[PDB]
């Protein structure tokens, strides 16, 4: 029977559908003032408080809801989500398991339990629990879409086309019902959704930040109109949770120190605590100001701090990735706010003005897939610190064994001095001043092979320190992660990774989720046309290896055609790319950071640009490099380009030499020029704002 508080609860339910969140709270609270023992009112109020970010208070009402109704399995599940958001994964897990034990048919708890496993890398366990959730509730969009991503990570392509068809129909149905899509924005690049669908997904998720900041009830920030208080300097703020041992940091760590201190004042806002790595040290020691916002949990106070610094241009280096605090940008503490480098997609949000990209990555004809205005960098928006992090890979030498450049490679800072101690060093000349020292098969050469085959850590030849490529972490762990430059000479051989000493090696060091059935089929075609070639992949994760292999068998490839390797330390991973002949980029989602890694090794990369940002980054990197003949307009051209590289050995030599020279001469790895071009772009933005205009496209 309906009571008095029962009506108030129903009234607030309506307000929650209307979107009028704040009034729903008042009605939920008024209902609890009438009936303090109202379990449903407690659960509902807490569900709203959770949306508002008031987690501690939501947790309070969740416990009360359970004290009143001990069989409220739905209250357990929601309390877990709150605890999961409160970084108490321990307590969250307990809530889910308790819920399942009370009601084994409660599908939502099984789904939430699977999400915990998924976030913890336990993919097979996550898949198992998602299937249980779906077996209980067949119409479960959140579970289905999460399972879809789980199957993507491990390359489970069972009913792939049917699965893609349903994913789209789910997002479409949800967008037409005006509900939050079950597909995460960072995952939208993987599915055959429309451009409109993806931007809509980004928009819906952006609006989640609005709810969390509206409760603060903060007035609009008064923004600077000039550079007077800043002494004629533009104040640029870089907001990231990746200042440390993270891919983002690797690319841009040099950039803040290379800014012009006469025109710019750099502020780095860290969303993560100090991990002690050298990457964090460099940025802290080179940025004009370093602010640890990880010690400022409240978005209101954090945004206040940003505004109190007088930031003109605030930069979002996270977007929709792990550790992002987009509530900061939603509060708009800066007059100009831009997306940069970190997130390969649109934010879909009103509180984001520009997105720093380029002509190649984001051509003007597809600007309608972004919500922000386009802000073109001259060449490519992408950057890497490979010139600074791995200067020992700038020059190499090889060992002959009866001349190839990827069988037995030696790198080192004092490498040229080591070669001068050797009697019969051959100097092979590259074409388009460059050379490649070749060591003949003598006593010294055999001593090195001995170290490799035996599995020794290191040896000493003529006083020089000759190190094993597989033992970099046992000699200098700092050099292994890339925090330091190796102070010894490192030997890298194909035998170390089980690669055949006489075969064409196609490599792809990306995570396995980037591969779809059409890509493996595309690669199988290449491998079949090049009989003496192999495909080099990584166990990323390892459980994807039996899956990838299985489909390769069905396409007609013997097992020995694809060779897997474990994930290596950062330095080893970049360096061992020297062993490959050609890198086959993934068309569904390009290798972004990994793309810069293979290029620094001088390894040519074949790519096929898609329509999404993430599927066009590699091609943007290649145009900047100067290798337009490595870009394919369709699948057939992709396969053709690779097949030619694997059969025309003199053509392969010309292209490999082209990448080896233009990785230094082109502006691709030039962090100094990139910074200046970025600065030039910053000023165009500010002058546009200072003139009294609202953000518009920047095409130089
Ligand atoms: C699609 C997408 O999300 N793109 C993002 C870009 O948009 C951002 O601009 C990049 C900067 O944040 S991050 C991201 O870049 P991606 O290119 O997807 O790489 P991802 O995040 O899988 O990890 C590769 C790392 O593992 C290291 N790595 C890899 C293999 C290995 O054996 N050893 C190793 O150290 C590599 O050296 C790298 O350090």
Domain shared by 235 and 377, yes or no: yes
Please tell me if the CB atom of residue 344 comes closer than 6 angstroms to any atom of ligand 1: yes
CA dist 340 to 39, 233, 374, Å? 46, 21, 11
Nearest to 253 by CA among 481, 472, 412: 481
Answer whether 385's CB lies under 8 Å from 252's CB: yes
Angstrom distance (rounded) from CA 582 to CA 652: 9
Which of 191, 592, 596, when mutated, tests ligand 1's pocket best, judged by the most ligand atoms within 8 Å of its CB?
592
Please tell me if the CB atom of residue 444 comes closer than 6 angstroms to any atom of ligand 1: no
Residue entry with tokens 């490498």: 415
- Residues 6+ away with beta carbon under 8 Å from 412: 392, 418, 486, 488, 489, 490
Answer whether 535's CB lies under 8 Å from 562's CB: yes
For residue 627, give the DSSP letter.
Answer: -
Domain shared by 254 and 353, yes or no: yes
For residue 532, give the DSSP letter.
Answer: T
The residues with which 490 forms a beta bridge, in sequence order, are 411, 467
Domain shared by 130 and 167, yes or no: yes
The CATH number assigned to the domain holding 33 equals 1.25.40.10
Answer whether 319's CB lies under 8 Å from 339's CB: yes
The CATH number assigned to the domain holding 480 equals 3.30.720.150
Which of 377, 593, 618, when mutated, tests ligand 1's pocket best, judged by the most ligand atoms within 8 Å of its CB?
593
CA dist 262 to 129, 226, 232, 234, 283, Å? 57, 16, 8, 9, 19
CA-angle at 184, arms to 53 and 300, nearest 5°: 25
Nearest to 236 by CA among 686, 650, 586, 583: 686
Determine if residue 576 is labeled as part of a ligand binding site. yes
Strands 435-439 vs 397-399: parallel, antiparallel or unpaired:
parallel
Distance 247 CA to ligand 1 centre (A): 6
For residue 494, give the DSSP letter.
Answer: G
Ligand 1 closest atom vs CA 572:
33
What are phi and psi for residue 235, nearest 5 degrees? -95, 105
Last residue of a domain, one of 465, 485, 502: 502
Please tell me if the CB atom of residue 149 comes closer than 6 angstroms to any atom of ligand 1: no
For residues 640, 643, 648 and 651, what is the CA-based torsion angle, rounded to 10 degrees?
60
Angstrom distance (rounded) from CA 538 to CA 594: 12
For residue 698, give the DSSP letter.
Answer: B
Domain shared by 151 and 209, yes or no: yes
The CATH number assigned to the domain holding 533 equals 3.40.50.2000
Domain shared by 377 and 231, yes or no: yes
Nearest to 524 by CA among 504, 551, 498: 551
The CATH number assigned to the domain holding 377 equals 3.40.50.11380
**568 SS3 class:** coil
Q: Element (H or E) spanning 355, and its range? A: strand 354-358
Answer whether 176's CB lies under 8 Å from 170's CB: no
DSSP 32-81: HHH-TT-HHHHHHHHHHHHHTT-HHHHHHHHHHHHHH-TT-HHHHHHHHH
Please tell me if the CB atom of residue 115 comes closer than 6 angstroms to any atom of ligand 1: no
How many domains does the chain fold into?
Answer: 5
Answer whether 103's CB lies under 8 Å from 71's CB: yes
Answer whether 632's CB lies under 8 Å from 667's CB: no
Answer whether 9's CB lies under 8 Å from 26's CB: no
Angstrom distance (rounded) from CA 615 to CA 618: 7
The residues with which 356 forms a beta bridge, in sequence order, are 340, 375
Give the chain's largest Cα–Cα span: 99
Residue entry with tokens 């910074």: 675
Angstrom distance (rounded) from CA 624 to CA 489: 31
The residues with which 489 forms a beta bridge, in sequence order, are 466
Resolution of the solved structure (Å): 3.0
Structural tokens at position 523: 């690669």
Domain shared by 379 and 423, yes or no: no
Please tell me if the CB atom of residue 61 comes closer than 6 angstroms to any atom of ligand 1: no
Domain shared by 512 and 648, yes or no: yes
Structural tokens at position 107: 């599908």
Distance 477 CA to ligand 1 centre (A): 20
C-alpha 112, offset from chain centre: 24
Ligand 1 closest atom vs CA 570:
35
Angstrom distance (rounded) from CA 34 to CA 42: 12
Range of the domain at 75: 1-106
Domain shared by 171 and 276, yes or no: no
Strands 234-240 vs 582-584: parallel, antiparallel or unpaired:
unpaired
- Residues 6+ away with beta carbon under 8 Å from 529: 639, 643, 646, 647
Give the dihedral sign, CA 81/82/84/85: positive
Tell me the chain's radius of gyration from C-alpha atoms.
Answer: 28
Last residue of a domain, one of 106, 123, 145: 106
Angstrom distance (rounded) from CA 202 to CA 347: 5
Answer whether 23's CB lies under 8 Å from 7's CB: no
Domain shared by 371 and 329, yes or no: yes
Angstrom distance (rounded) from CA 97 to CA 77: 9
Ordered strands of the 582-584 beta sheet: 562-565, 533-538, 504-507, 582-584, 605-606
Angstrom distance (rounded) from CA 562 to CA 579: 15
Structural tokens at position 206: 């952006």
Last residue of a domain, one of 502, 527, 547: 502
Output the 3-class SS for 368-402: HHCCCEEEEECCCCCCCCHHHHCHHHCCCEEECCC
Residues carrying an active site annotation: 186
Ligand 1 closest atom vs CA 514:
1
Answer whether 622's CB lies under 8 Å from 628's CB: yes
Domain shared by 535 and 656, yes or no: yes
Determine if residue 592 is labeled as part of a ligand binding site. yes
Distance 102 CA to ligand 1 centre (A): 42
Q: Given its phi and psi angles, is residue 634 left (phi above 0), alpha (psi -120 to 50 degrees) or beta? A: beta
For residue 672, give the DSSP letter.
Answer: H
**149 SS3 class:** helix
**Which residue pairs from 401-407 have beta carbons closer than 8 angstroms and sit at least 24 positions apart in sequence?**
401/441, 401/445, 401/449, 402/441, 403/428, 403/438, 405/436, 405/578, 405/656, 406/494, 406/505, 406/578, 406/579, 406/580, 406/581, 407/493, 407/494, 407/501, 407/579
Angstrom distance (rounded) from CA 515 to CA 153: 9
- Residues 6+ away with beta carbon under 8 Å from 226: 690
For residue 11, give the DSSP letter.
Answer: H
- Residues 6+ away with beta carbon under 8 Å from 422: 439, 444, 462
Please tell me if the CB atom of residue 480 comes closer than 6 angstroms to any atom of ligand 1: no
Answer whether 205's CB lies under 8 Å from 320's CB: yes
Structural tokens at position 700: 């130089």
- Residues 6+ away with beta carbon under 8 Å from 155: 512, 513, 515, 544, 547, 548, 551
| Helices 107-119, 73-85: crossing angle, 10 deg rounding | 20
Angstrom distance (rounded) from CA 64 to CA 669: 58
Domain shared by 172 and 308, yes or no: no
Domain shared by 429 and 283, yes or no: no
């Amino acid at each position: 029977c309906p009571t008095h508080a029962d009506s108030l609860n129903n009234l607030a339910n309506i307000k929650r559908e209307q979107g009028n969140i704040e009034e729903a709270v008042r009605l939920y609270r008024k209902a609890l003032e009438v009936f303090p023992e109202f379990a449903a009112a407690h659960s509902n109020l807490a569900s709203v408080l959770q949306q508002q970010g008031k987690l501690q208070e939501a947790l309070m009402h969740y416990k009360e809801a359970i004290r009143i109704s001990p069989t409220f399995a739905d209250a357990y599940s929601n309390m877990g989500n709150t605890l999961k958001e409160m970084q108490d994964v321990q307590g969250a897990l307990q809530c889910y398991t308790r819920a399942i034990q009370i009601n084994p048919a409660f599908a939502d708890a099984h789904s939430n339990l699977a999400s915990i496993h998924k976030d913890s890398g336990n993919i097979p366990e996550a898949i198992a629990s998602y299937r249980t959730a779906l077996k209980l509730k067949p119409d479960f969009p959140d579970a289905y879409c999460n399972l879809a991503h789980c199957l993507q990570i491990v390359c489970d392509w069972t009913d792939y086309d049917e699965r893609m068809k349903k994913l789209v129909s789910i997002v479409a149905d949800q967008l037409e019902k005006n509900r939050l899509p079950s597909v995460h924005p960072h995952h939208s690049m993987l599915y055959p959704l429309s451009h409109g669908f993806r931007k809509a997904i980004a928009e819906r998720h952006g609006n989640l930040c609005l709810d969390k900041i509206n409760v603060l009830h903060k007035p609009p920030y008064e923004h600077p109109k000039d550079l007077k208080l800043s002494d004629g300097r533009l104040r640029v703020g870089y907001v990231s949770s990746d200042f440390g041992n993270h891919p983002t940091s690797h690319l841009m760590q040099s950039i803040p120190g290379m800014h012009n201190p006469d025109k710019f004042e750099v502020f780095c806002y860290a969303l993560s605590p100090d991990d002690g790595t050298n990457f964090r040290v460099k940025v802290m020691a080179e940025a004009n100001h370093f602010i640890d916002l990880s010690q400022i949990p409240c978005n209101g106070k954090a945004a206040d701090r940003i505004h109190q610094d007088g930031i003109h241009i605030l930069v979002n280096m996270n977007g929709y990735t792990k550790g992002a605090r987009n509530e900061l940008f939603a509060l708009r503490p800066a007059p100009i706010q831009a997306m940069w480098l970190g997130y390969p997609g649109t934010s879909g949000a009103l509180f984001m003005d520009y997105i720093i990209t380029d002509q190649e990555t984001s051509p003007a004809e597809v600007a309608e897939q972004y919500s922000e205005k386009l802000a073109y960098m001259p060449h490519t928006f992408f950057i890497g610190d490979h010139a600074n992090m791995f200067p020992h890979l700038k020059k190499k030498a090889v060992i002959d064994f009866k001349i190839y450049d990827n069988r037995i490679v030696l790198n080192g800072i004092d490498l040229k001095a080591f070669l001068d101690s050797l009697p019969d060093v051959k100097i092979v000349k590259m074409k388009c001043a460059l050379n490649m020292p070749v060591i003949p098969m003598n006593t010294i050469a055999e001593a090195v092979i001995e170290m490799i085959n035996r599995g020794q850590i290191q040896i000493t030849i003529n006083g020089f320190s000759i190190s094993n490529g597989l033992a970099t972490t046992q000699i200098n762990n700092k050099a292994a992660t890339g925090e330091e430059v190796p102070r010894t000479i490192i030997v890298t051989t194909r035998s170390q990774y089980g690669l055949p000493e006489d075969a064409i090696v196609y490599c792809n060091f990306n995570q396995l989720y980037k591969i779809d059935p059409s890509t493996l089929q595309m690669w199988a075609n290449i491998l079949k046309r090049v009989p003496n070639s192999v495909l080099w992949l990584l166990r990323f994760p390892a459980v994807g290896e039996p899956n990838i292999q299985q489909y390769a068998q069905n396409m007609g490839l013997p097992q020995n055609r694809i060779i897997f390797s474990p994930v290596a330390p950062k330095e080893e991973h970049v360096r061992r790319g020297q062993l490959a002949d050609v890198c086959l980029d993934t068309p569904l989602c390009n290798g972004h950071t990994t793309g810069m890694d293979v290029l620094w090794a001088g390894t040519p990369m074949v790519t096929m640009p898609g329509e999404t940002l993430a599927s066009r980054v590699a091609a943007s990197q290649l145009t900047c490099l100067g290798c337009l003949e490595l870009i394919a307009k369709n699948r057939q051209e992709y396969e053709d380009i690779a097949v030619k590289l694997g059969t025309d050995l003199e053509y392969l030599k010309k292209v490999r030499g082209k990448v080896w020279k233009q990785r230094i001469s082109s502006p691709l790895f030039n962090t100094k020029q990139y910074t200046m071009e970025l600065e030039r772009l910053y000023l165009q933005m500010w002058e546009h704002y200072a003139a009294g205009n609202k953000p518009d496209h920047m095409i130089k």
